[PDB]
Ligand binder design. Structure first.
Ligand SMILES: *C/C=C(C)/C=C/C=C(C)/C=C/C1=C(C)CCCC1(C)C
Length: 240
């Protein structure tokens, strides 16, 4: 691979590894809002989802780093077949988002995201013009999923803001809004990147697409999980 590609892969792998190790340490040391439960997150494993996500992401990038230094394909599921790592991660991200917000249809939303990602995987491994049909079907399903998840997220954000008066509550709400903006705005770029890649309109080269994918992953995973975590710890739920 090119110097830029290997450098971006190494930077992304190191960033996600550091983020995973910090999130795991914080989760293990977290003692709950009361500061008395030794294993608060042990009996609430959903709070660990973020951590696992990062770990999986890190592993994926590790494989990429190996593929960056060898002429032969590395771990095919995480390097060869596109969007499989996303198939594994993004549904967990949606589940975590709708769990911290106590939103309805969290499992339904996660399954919809998984189905959209599997449709995308089929589209990326298809041959034109059938690839266009797969992309159109995925686009309709993702439009429906995006509208549904936004409607739930907006209604939970309004509910949370209605009963958030403490300064710490306001700070946690700002972090939650930052995480929501990262989740919604950034996710819209992935379809734009696919439609702008060598597939369909070939304008952006492979290297720039890969670097943009790495940056979007790093942001929308590391910063997203950190914000979610700031919000979960520093937002009193009993204010409902
Ligand atoms: C950490 C990585 C994440 C959250 C990746 C998310 C990716 C998507 C939401 C991708 C969506 C796509 C479509 C809606 C259309 C087909 C092409 C995709 C896979 C880019």
């Amino acid at each position: 691979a090119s110097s830029a590609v290997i450098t971006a892969n190494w930077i992304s792998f190191l960033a996600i590894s550091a983020s995973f190790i910090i999130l795991l340490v914080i989760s293990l040391r977290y003692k709950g809002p009361g500061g008395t439960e030794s294993f608060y997150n042990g009996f609430k494993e959903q709070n660990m989802l973020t951590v696992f996500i990062n770990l999986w992401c890190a592993l994926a990038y590790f494989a990429k780093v190996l593929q960056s230094h060898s002429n032969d394909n590395g771990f095919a599921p995480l390097t060869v077949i596109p969007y499989v790592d996303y198939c594994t991660t993004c549904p967990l991200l949606t589940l975590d988002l709708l769990w911290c917000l106590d939103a309805p249809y969290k499992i339904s939303s996660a399954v919809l995201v998984f189905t959209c990602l599997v449709i995308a995987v089929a589209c990326s491994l298809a041959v034109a013009p059938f690839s266009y049909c797969w992309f159109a079907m995925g686009m309709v399903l993702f439009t429906f999923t995006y509208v549904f998840i936004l409607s739930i997220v907006r209604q939970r954000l309004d509910f949370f803001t209605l009963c958030a008066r403490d300064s710490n509550a306001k700070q946690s709400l700002k972090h939650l809004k930052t995480a929501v903006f990262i989740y919604f705005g950034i996710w819209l770029l992935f379809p734009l990147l696919w439609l702008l890649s060598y597939r369909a309109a070939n304008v952006i080269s492979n290297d720039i697409n890969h670097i943009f994918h790495c940056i979007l992953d790093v942001i929308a995973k590391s910063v997203y999980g950190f914000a979610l975590l700031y919000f979960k710890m520093y937002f009193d739920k009993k204010l409902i």
